[PDB]
Amino acid sequence: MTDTEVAQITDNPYKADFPILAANPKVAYLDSAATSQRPRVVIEAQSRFYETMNDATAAIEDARASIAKFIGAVDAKPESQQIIFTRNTSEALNLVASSLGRYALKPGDDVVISIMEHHSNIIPWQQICKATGANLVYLRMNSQYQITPEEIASKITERAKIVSVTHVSNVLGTRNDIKAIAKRTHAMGAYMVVDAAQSAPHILVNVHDLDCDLLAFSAHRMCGPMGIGVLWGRAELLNAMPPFLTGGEMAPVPEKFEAGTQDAAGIYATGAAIKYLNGLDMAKIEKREELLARYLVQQLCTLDFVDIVGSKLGQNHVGAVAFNVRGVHPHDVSSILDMNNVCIRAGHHCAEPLLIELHESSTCRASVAFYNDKHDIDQLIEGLNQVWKIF
Ligand X SMILES: Cc1ncc(COP(=O)(O)O)c(CNCC(=O)O)c1O
How far apart CA 213 and CA 68 sit, in angstroms, is 14
Residue 40 makes CB contacts below 8 A (sequence gap 6+) with 17, 18, 19
List of residues 6+ apart from 7 with CB closer than 8 A: none
- Residue closer to ligand X by CB (options 249, 281) is 249
d(CA 389, CA 337): 13
**Has 362 been labeled as part of a binding site?**
no
Using DSSP, state whether 215 is helix, strand or coil: strand
| Residue 20 contact, options a second copy, ligand X, none, Cβ 5-8 Å cut-off depending on partner type | a second copy
* Rounded distance between C-alpha atoms, residue 139 and residue 381, angstroms: 34
Whole-number Å distance between alpha carbons of 156 and 110? 8
Alpha-carbon distances of 360 from 5, 320, 352, rounded to whole Å:
34, 17, 9
Q: How many residues bind a second copy (CB under 8 A)?
A: 53
33, interface contact from ligand X, a second copy, none, CB < 5-8 Å by kind:
ligand X
Contact string 74-93 vs ligand X (x = CB under 6 A) = --------------xxx---
The one among 185, 218, 270, 367 contacting a second copy by CB under 8 A: 218
* Residue from 131, 117, 181 nearest 155 by CA: 181
- Contacted by 201, from ligand X, a second copy, none: CB < 5 to 8 Å by type: none
Set 129, 301, 343, 350: catalytic member: 350
User: Which of ligand X, a second copy, none does residue 383 bind to, with CB < 5 to 8 Å depending on kind?
Assistant: none
Residue 120 in contact with ligand X, rule: CB under 6 A: yes
Breaks (C-N over 2.5 A) in the chain follow: 54, 75, 250
Binding site partner of 262, from ligand X, a second copy, none, Cβ cut-off 5-8 A by kind:
a second copy
Residue 129 annotated as catalytic: no
Residue from 30, 84, 93, 380 touching a second copy (CB under 8 A): that is 93
Exactly one of 42, 141, 197, 265 binds ligand X (CB under 6 A); that residue is 197
Residue type, 160: A
- To ligand X, the closest distance from the beta carbon of 7 in angstroms equals 30
Instruction: Rule CB under 8 A: say whether 201 interacts with a second copy.
Output: no
189 backbone φψ class: left, alpha, beta (φ>0; ψ -120 to 50) = left
Applying CB under 8 A, among 220, 288, 294, 317 the residue interacting with a second copy is 220
Q: Find out whether 217 and 196 touch, Cβ atoms under 8 Å.
A: yes
Q: Which residues are catalytic?
A: 350
Interaction site with ligand X (CB under 6 A): 33-34, 88-90, 118, 120-121, 166, 170, 195, 197-198, 218, 229, 248, 260-261, 345, 349-350
Interaction site with a second copy (CB under 8 A): 19-20, 23, 35, 37-38, 40, 42-44, 46-47, 50-54, 87-91, 93-94, 118-124, 127, 218, 220, 225-227, 229, 245-250, 259-266, 350
